[PDB]
């Protein structure tokens, strides 16, 4: 299965991701670590990702999200939900049950099973910032734990976000590592202290 590029590429529109500050409390459902470039989140909980461009992209620009495995041994294997989570009765009517990454609160979200690579992705219309903001925000959900055997199985994943034209040509790309886990605040503090070692 063809390996998608993970190379950062701001492109003509200066495309880049951002995250707002969230903290490492016990109650946190979703927290981003700059030092790790890693997002820590709970299963099926809102993950706000901020989109930035230097200049407005043409109408019909889209934003696609795709997971891949981080380690090179596994980057050819397709990231999918585990055999147990794909049988849950949890489809919002848009997301197919095998897809790890969902978009929350956007009826124009489209889900793709690539016919040649078999990789999953979810894609939405790029939209201008809502009233009184300077970022466009997309809300993602991750539908499998990182520990789920027969799925990610403790293998780290990257989420790749690509800005695309209406034909799906690349306009820009950014990415971040993801851990879906029960206590994200605790796990973020854990991994951050290790990197200081
Ligand atoms: C998914 N969906 C349901 N309803 C249950 C239960 N009980 N477990 C999973 C999983 N994994
Ligand atoms: C996507 N689409 C539009 N129209 C705008 C604006 N303004 N920003 C993005 C992004 N990111
Ligand atoms: Zn699972």
UniProtKB/Swiss-Prot annotation:
Note the effect listed for residue 76 to S.
In sporadic cancers; somatic mutation
Mutation effect (residue 123 to G): In sporadic cancers; somatic mutation
Result of altering residue 186 to S: In sporadic cancers; somatic mutation
Mutating residue 113 to H has which effect?
In sporadic cancers; somatic mutation
Q: Where is this region: Interaction with DNA?
A: 179-186
Effect in UniProt of substituting residue 187 to Y = In sporadic cancers; somatic mutation
What would changing residue 3 to I do, according to UniProt? In familial cancer not matching LFS; germline mutation and in a sporadic cancer; somatic mutation
Outcome when changing residue 191 to D: In sporadic cancers; somatic mutation
What happens upon changing residue 119 to Q?
In LFS; germline mutation and in sporadic cancers; somatic mutation
Question: Impact of mutating residue 125 to C?
Answer: In a sporadic cancer; somatic mutation; requires 2 nucleotide substitutions
Effect recorded for residue 168 to D:
In sporadic cancers; somatic mutation
Effect recorded for residue 83 to A: In a sporadic cancer; somatic mutation
Q: Describe what happens upon changing residue 23 to R.
A: In sporadic cancers; somatic mutation
* Consequence when changing residue 119 to W: In sporadic cancers; somatic mutation
Q: What is the effect of changing residue 197 to N?
A: In sporadic cancers; somatic mutation
Q: State how changing residue 140 to D affects the protein, per the record.
A: In sporadic cancers; somatic mutation
What mutagenesis or variant effect is reported for residue 74 to R? Answer: In sporadic cancers; somatic mutation
- Indicate the impact reported for residue 77 to A: In a sporadic cancer; somatic mutation
What changing residue 164 to L does, per the record, is: In a sporadic cancer; somatic mutation; requires 2 nucleotide substitutions
- What does altering residue 96 to H do? In a sporadic cancer; somatic mutation
Q: What happens upon changing residue 123 to A?
A: In sporadic cancers; somatic mutation
Give the result of residue 105 to E, as annotated: In sporadic cancers; somatic mutation
Upon changing residue 89 to A, the result is:
Abolishes strongly phosphorylation
UniProt-recorded name of the protein: Cellular tumor antigen p53
Q: Which species?
A: Homo sapiens
What gene is this protein a product of? TP53
Q: Which residues of the full protein are shown?
A: 95 to 291 of 393
């Amino acid at each position: 299965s063809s390996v998608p590029s993970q190379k950062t590429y701001q492109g003509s529109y200066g495309f880049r991701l951002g995250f707002l500050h969230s903290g490492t409390a016990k109650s946190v459902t979703c927290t981003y670590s700059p030092a790790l470039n890693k997002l820590f989140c709970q299963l099926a909980k809102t993950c706000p990702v901020q989109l930035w461009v230097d200049s407005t992209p043409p109408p019909g620009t889209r934003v696609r999200a795709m997971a891949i495995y981080k380690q090179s041994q596994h980057m050819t294997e397709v990231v999918r939900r585990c055999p147990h989570h794909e049988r849950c009765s949890d489809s919002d009517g848009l997301a197919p049950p095998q897809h790890l990454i969902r978009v929350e609160g956007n009826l124009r979200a489209e889900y793709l099973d690539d016919r040649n690579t078999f990789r999953h992705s979810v894609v939405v219309p790029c939209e201008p910032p809502e009233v009184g903001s300077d970022c466009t925000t997309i809300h993602y959900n991750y539908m499998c734990y990182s520990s789920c055997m027969g799925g990610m199985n403790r293998r780290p994943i990257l989420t790749i976000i690509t800005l695309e034209d209406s034909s799906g040509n690349l306009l820009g790309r950014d990415s971040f590592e993801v851990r879906v886990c029960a206590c994200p605040g605790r796990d973020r503090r854990t991994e951050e202290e290790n990197l200081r070692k």
